[PDB]
């Protein structure tokens, strides 16, 4: 008769908890899963953060309505028992192939056979996950945005396993928490967003490396250009220059060069953006 | 004692006859040149279009003053007298290593010793050009965009051998004409816009191709993550799918793909973009 309604999120560090906590305000019934007591009481500190900035800044949560659904929240650290009544599972555990691929044998095993599976991964890829899981037409990504009670994407991307009319339930559970669902139709790394921001960001910090044009001005290049209100080094002071660093270290030549340029100049001086104050811009 | 007065631009096509007018607009004297009776007759044409346009755009431009303007210009199709008495050329000619070979090596005999000469070429570079010129410290780029009175960059970006007291004069000539300078310090093919922009259409026409993602699909989800007005593909259709068709078509294996894309899927069915109605938008 009814679809989704338990949901169990494995992980509740910074996008495990907004995703459990965003799914709880809109009314599903979230049991949030992590390895010990002493990670689930760091969890319900969030959780507690999560609901006082919903009362602030997010329709509809203000006079107790963010508390109830704070109240609401289940917590475990046992598996089996976290995903026994389990309809979907949002995995937000860390990027770490090995810790996934040990998380999605069990989860396999655990979960009863209606239960679909959603990565939110970032790099590793659902076909990279697609065999430890062992039900690959029920296994796809979601993958979500930091802040995403604002910034309320949610890529769906599944494997040539996938299901379509799992695919299709996710993408409706997306907006019944009130996302937007950016659908995917083949796999493709970074998705749709990274896969179009990284090549802008890129493209800045060579002009900025080979000295061809100060932050200044290739930002107001871009804003006046594009009409856009944000240039690329106002971006990398809103992702976090330690962020920028470890992505472009792991790149071509001319990414690197960029990287030991960040080093040098922001990260060695604690300029590290937006969030501690100071970057390419003073906040 | 004084400085740039006297102003000849070479060429009164699509972006000849705009950077002429702004000029002519914003007081200084203008002459422009072209090359027999009829290409004069029709620059006329282009400038009377122009101060249409001024008077119901362009701050300043009402009751008269864009007439004023217009009737202000001086023609001419022999470019010894066009230059005679010129401070600074701005040259627009077609985009042609051969015409513009041609047209600098003239110049630089012509024009007197004081003038300074600025290319507007989007994809010639100086260096390219300077040789012709005969003097490199009194040569650089001043690259504008279609529509100068509200796309009001102008990208100064010189030679290794440009001059830079002149270099700050033509930054100084751009804001007298109400343009936004974009210093490069050193050079670059595309400038800086062109640099950021072709990388971003790139990486969205590859999503495209490959299947991964509907136009709509990417342009919501550039817009939503970045706050952007304008999605990847509102952008193709106001480039006009004919000039990303010609530049997709010289580069790469994923971008020619995409240019036989654009040519099976728009233009062969007449669907150019913006300018004639509908491209990836029906407008
Ligand atoms: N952080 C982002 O901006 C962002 C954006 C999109 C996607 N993601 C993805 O989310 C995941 C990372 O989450 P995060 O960085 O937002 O939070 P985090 O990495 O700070 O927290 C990880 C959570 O997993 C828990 N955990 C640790 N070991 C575990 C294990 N053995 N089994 C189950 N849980 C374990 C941690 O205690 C914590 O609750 C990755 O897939 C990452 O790519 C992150
Ligand atoms: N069109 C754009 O969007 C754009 C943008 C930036 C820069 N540019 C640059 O401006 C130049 C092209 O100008 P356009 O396309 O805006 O106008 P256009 O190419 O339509 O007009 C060219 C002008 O040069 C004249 N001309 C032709 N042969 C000539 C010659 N032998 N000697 C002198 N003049 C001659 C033509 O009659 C016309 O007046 C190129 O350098 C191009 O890269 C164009």
Redesign the interface.
Known sequence: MTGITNVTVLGTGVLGSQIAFQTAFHGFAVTAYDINTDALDAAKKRFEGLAAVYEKEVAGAADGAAQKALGGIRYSDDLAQAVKDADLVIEAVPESLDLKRDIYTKLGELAPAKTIFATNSSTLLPSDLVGYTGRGDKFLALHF?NHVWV???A?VMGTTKTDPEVYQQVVEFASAIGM?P?????E?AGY??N??????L???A??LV?????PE??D???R???????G?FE?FDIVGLTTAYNISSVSGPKQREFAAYLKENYIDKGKLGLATGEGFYRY
Chains 1, 2 share one sequence.
């Open positions: 945005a910034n309320n994407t890529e937007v950016i659908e995917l139709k083949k493709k749709v967003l896969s179009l921001l990284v090549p802008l890129d493209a800045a060579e002009l080979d000295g061809i044009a100060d001005t290739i107001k290049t871009w006046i250009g594009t009409g856009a209100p944000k690329p971006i």
